[PDB]
């Protein structure tokens, strides 16, 4: 059920220690990574227009 991600937790065999944690700011790295991936096409297309007009 942790592999199913229904709640926050992780098991243990050697020590049996239970740890519960969460990561609230999920909407930052998604929007940032999408801006990087979308801007890659912008810079590459710019290099296509300049590479087309120069050579």
């Amino acid at each position: 059920m942790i592999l199913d991600k229904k709640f926050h937790g992780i098991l243990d065999q050697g020590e049996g220690v239970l740890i519960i944690f969460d990561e609230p700011p999920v909407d930052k790295t998604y929007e940032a990574a999408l801006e990087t991936i979308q801007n890659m096409s912008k810079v590459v297309d710019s290099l296509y227009n300049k590479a087309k007009k120069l050579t």
């Binding site: 700011p25 929007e31 940032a32 801006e35």
Partner: protein, 57 residues
Amino acid sequence: NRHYYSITINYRKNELEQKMLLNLHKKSWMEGLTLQDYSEHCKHNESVVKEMLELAK
């Protein structure tokens, strides 16, 4: 305009009105101790502005 004309208008301001009203308006856009509402936004950058940064993105 027939039988009814007008006249030009100019202004005048001495240094007491300039500094009293100028510093009074700058203070009217400033704080009391001028250090109060700075940390409010400095620490609102982590709570409220994050929503404005996500929406900005």
